[model samples]
Target: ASTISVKDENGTVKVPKDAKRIVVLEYSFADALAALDVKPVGIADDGKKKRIIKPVREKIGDYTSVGTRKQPNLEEISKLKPDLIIADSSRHKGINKELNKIAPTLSLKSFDGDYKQNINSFKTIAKALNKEKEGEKRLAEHDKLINKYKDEIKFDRNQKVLPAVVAKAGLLAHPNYSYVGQFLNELGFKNALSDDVTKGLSKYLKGPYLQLDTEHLADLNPERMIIMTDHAKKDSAEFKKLQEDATWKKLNAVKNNRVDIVDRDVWARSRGLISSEEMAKELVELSKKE
Candidate 1:
């Protein structure tokens, strides 16, 4: 039952149901797959601590390390004998042709102002797995949960909520349209970045990353904050350590404890239905005032 849905980076949406083994190129995509209860036979693993999942790392203890983030090892990916391989078009441009030769490759590329494009990363994956119905159901649930936030979260004196805390590691901040921005929109939170500040969506993008400083955030500190995590990065510790600092203590988000640290692998990095659902739940729980 192939539908005429527009294909995302993964290509046509007609995923074979018989697909037993899956390989996710993007770490976040793996999180989405796991949320759907689809454990891929193999994921693009690297010895780098950030790319590896704690649970997966604990269970398997070891898996073949593919190349790094952007440049994947085609030979190793081929040996995994995956039925479907999902990669980020923006990040994996170097390996797309090689990966396609091994198995069907889906390239999901985005992190821009046109977030609707990133939201549809779900459809592309669903079409590939022949799980479009399931994907829709998940999306519907995500929408319902988000609307509930609107009903309850009471934007307060503020008309729009902004995720003030962002992913900044070792003084390096994520460009604007990165994963954090996408999640903010999902939770119905507003982007604090002015239209003037937007870098405009990159074509077949890797990262808008939209770097801004503390001064910028303090000025636009919307109503709340959603700090994204990349637990695998060696610098994640720096991000985690913010809780103790005075600079963190002074921010509006920190004052209210409106900050949330999500599992990078599960929510921020992943694209698709299950990831959306997980994010909705997290927002509900984290945003609750204790």
Candidate 2:
């Protein structure tokens, strides 16, 4: 069978030119695989494949959860006998050595807060899978889809939007370079939060984000707020606690009733063409109603 050699974060490796059996350790990679019509045999779903962001969940087929993102079950992964393994550089780099023993592993930067780098990574994965043409087509379709949604939604460019995820401790807002920033810009909404200092969730991955206290919420006071809620905190007591906060109520978005609650699974967690398209649609739809 024909084979291909691609250089990635972990150097070059040779695999079947058209690798069919693939396993993804990250959701964004799974998004890339699904957009390319390649169903993953194994996934590090962290016990929530059913809770995967909706747009991606619809595109992908059934697969066994290898385990959580932090620690995938090596034995279960070995049993799958995948032709290739896709991993997040920051999240799964430590396990690269172990994964390589099982199959040709591609270590990629999943969410470095740079859209350009993310797209480049997607193309690289396409090269490894020998789906470059399909990859390019999907990227173009994404741009086209965003424009179409822009025209349909017609979001006001002057309106400032603050995108934040409700974390256990407080509100974690995406900076100007996160996936949330990318989608907001594509759809023509202005991002209001601008903390130049760089901070991130993982030590291995340094990117743009801000931890917002209630007083900080009162500080930015953006015109519109998009809060990403996970299954645990969507309607939990924590959100209720935020609701009762005088500082949270002091925000202009809250006072104006311009706040929109979005799913954290898709908006905050995953990044890819598919996720961007879904975001574009959601932004336009949400803006129209609120």
Candidate 3:
């Protein structure tokens, strides 16, 4: 078949079978392509090649930058003359028509998708590229890797865990529906802020993560915490302020030293089979500390 119909977040998109010149607008999509042993001709890497991560970058090698994932450069994308364009459903919906004019755009869930959704999107992308058999093989290997990590971790399943992104602005706690939360849950940990708990706080607030303060963290009091910060410095003002805060000190995770800092790019931005495996491996190592 010269073309294959694959259903993405939007609808069914007919893409070229075994598309050679592909442009991926999201980091996750690039990861998907890399998993299938297919290198994208261009990637929207936020103008930073390092954001693609070492594992994915090693597989895909070099490629042209299509600008940031939030706002991909149309001129650069058009210049590639790509046969396939993999975009994010939430981020690229407004630019759908424009992208279609350049090439067939398969919009899949990325930014807003949970762990399961991201896995499903990888399958859809593989189908679009006519690599179903290869995708299934890789997926099976990924499943085995995750299960191995799960078996390696020894922790109390009842203990609540919180994964949050800490920046200079504040902390944003990932809820049960977020990718990180779901991933943690799959690894036999409980969400610190469950849906029922968050729902009681506000009926109007919506999204995967919640904007939280030190007081809110005290209220939640997760037994364990996985913190992702953009700033790597241990003496950064944000980290100092958080550690010095009376409310933050009162948290169970802090007192017990159950807090672990992770890479922000891998924890928050990159989402794919390879990235998930990396996370699983890290969790296994972190569990040894507990």
Candidate 4:
């Protein structure tokens, strides 16, 4: 078989250049592949996959849905006969094995909450797709943006933002070991709460996010607060109430109108390309206003 050879982002998966039809089994993979200009023949989407896929859906042509990422369509995946498939190790285990039978598969280990991990995971994929140089270019671009933000980010001498990563039921945060926490640190924003206070639900965040409440938020007493709101297709009662809460209003961020709502897709997810850049710009704006 005539095959073209190239390294995957991991460098662990050396893909052949003959890999024309790619199948991205996870959202981030979709993002990564898009960065490399390699569209997948199949994609496994869960909820809000639309948010990521909708924009590029047209350019990619017809694609197969291998069911929800949580429960993939292995039969459908085999039907697609993909050259390469990317799976999230933490989320899709059962499907990973089945998908491998049809095509060579590699688990993309998320370097959550760790900058080195981010650099490695991103560069590895870029390399795998023969986009190593592109990845370095992106890194340089990212660095430039970060430096631009840093120059403008006027902190209250502390350079910290009181932030929260709110989900559906209750509030939770990321541990410094998580991706988001690492991002915050990279951006030079000090976590409002003590670094020692580990987030109870750090796994979901896969990064550093803080749980906010009356006293706990008060204790942090941060000048600026960032709330990572859920992606609401339509605002229901819970969404409205979170905004209407008296306690939430009483917080210093609210009192001074210093709280900013970050788009979950860009700010929360382990995104590629634009998301990080978007976040950097947002952080710069947040400081400019403050």
- Winner by TM-score: 3
Per-prediction TM-score, please? 0.66, 0.88, 0.95, 0.78
Ranking by TM-score: 3, 2, 4, 1
| Candidate no. 3 TM-score | 0.95
lDDT of 2 by residue, 206-247 (tens): 235677768766766788888888742557777778788878
- Answer with 1 or 4, whichever has the higher TM-score: 4
Clashing pairs in 2: none
**Residue 213 C-alpha lDDT in model 1:** 49
Question: Residue by residue across 155-212, what tens digits does model 3's lDDT show?
Answer: 7778788888775444777888889999988888889888788786554243656777
Per-candidate local distance difference test: 0.56, 0.77, 0.85, 0.62
TM-score of 1: 0.66
Q: lDDT at 211 for candidate 3?
A: 74
Q: Find the 10 residues in a row with the least total lDDT in model 3.
A: 200-209
Candidate number that wins on TM-score, 3 or 4: 3
Tens-digit lDDT track of model 1 for 193-263: 54544443222123444444455555555455555556424245556565455555677766876655556
Clashes of each: 14, 0, 0, 21
Model number with the top lDDT: 3
Q: What ranges in model 1 sit over 4 Å off?
A: 1-19, 31-37, 47-67, 110-115, 149-178, 197-207, 217-223, 229-267, 272-275
